[PDB]
Amino acid sequence: SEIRKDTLKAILLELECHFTWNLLKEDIDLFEVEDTIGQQLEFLTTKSRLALYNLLAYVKHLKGQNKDALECLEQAEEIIQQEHSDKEEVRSLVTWGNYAWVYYHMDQLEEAQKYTGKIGNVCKKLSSPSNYKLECPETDCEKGWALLKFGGKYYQKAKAAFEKALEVEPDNPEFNIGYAITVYRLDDEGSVKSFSLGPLRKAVTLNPDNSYIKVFLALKLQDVHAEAEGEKYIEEILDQISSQPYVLRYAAKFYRRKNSWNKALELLKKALEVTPTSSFLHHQMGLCYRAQMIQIKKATHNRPKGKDKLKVDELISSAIFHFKAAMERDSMFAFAYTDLANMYAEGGQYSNAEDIFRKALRLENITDDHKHQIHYHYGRFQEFHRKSENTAIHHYLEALKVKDRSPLRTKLTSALKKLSTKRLCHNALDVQSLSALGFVYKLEGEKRQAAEYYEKAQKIDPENAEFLTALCELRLS
16 A cells, blocks of 8 residues: 555654665665674674664665564664663664664564554653654764764764764763764875864773774874874774774774784784675785785885795785685675776786776676776776777766766866877867867866867767757856
């Protein structure tokens, strides 16, 4: 019955939970997010298993695994009850909201209504101004963490949620970690900012035994050239994090940026032992082997000999090994494809690089951010290794069409201008170059120039709908 489904949905949309926080599937890699959450659940890396299971349940649903989502929600409930709180009904509202939505998506309307009913009863008892929700700092915090996990498009929204929570309890240890991590994420080659330094120090003060927050402080301290103070925090946590793969990968980053490669690898290996299925961790190892090789090549002016040549060959093979192991564990782990392809290209293995790039260019269910970077890297490969300028222009353009504002924007528009201008010097009637320039100048706001270029392209190709559309938009002035 579409009638009954829609009246229930009116109610489900009034709940506060993951299904009403606008957390879009298209903005994440579900397998990577699922891996990340799993790693955070390991060996009490967090004091917040409840939020993690609620989020994991939402992610399972997004992967089309509603039965597994129910299992996470059952684990969520057990964490609530086992706590024997006088506030177990209020603490249960997000978990109940997720239950209602999941049962709704499984076409179990009667079950969904049991949960909306329970949510309604609590809100009524507590005299909430809303029928189906109850304002609470804790829920703001949980929303904060969910937003944070969905990535860069949500960082400002996450910051707002944590600030809402902090408004009620400014010295809450948990809200402060969430706030400080968000500002850390917003601080992020830049140049790197240090707006997070204050909030991170505060969060560490409020959470003296927390390895998770300490490692971010160490990283930030490293960023502002206080590596020595940062290493003291790293040394403080090392014994506590030996079975905590999520924190280990950040401590390993700390050592990698110091060029302490064996230290970084020792930690990443500990991490892979807790979670051997992690694409993320394999890729991090590959980056670490690659960084070492680049450093050796520099120190030997690109001509390594002897034990250095030997080391370089081993590092290259080890890097390839881990990039492939990453791809094997998540066919959607796009960073592994491009880093692998770029390595083959650098070693002159063009067929191999092309094989990898073609797989990457055909991945469908990956974020626009990843497609954008894949197009960029393929464009660079075409420009500098194939020397195929038209093919490069095609992919630089696709990169911009997928994502027009990113740290790659300046590089993309500069390359498009250069190759298009060069081409137009040879053939004033090259349609691809004319329209590339029209696209770039429109994107930059140079509307007269953009119209001039598109008008030339259209006169040569009169029925091209893209040129007609771009021109219609420009004529709006």
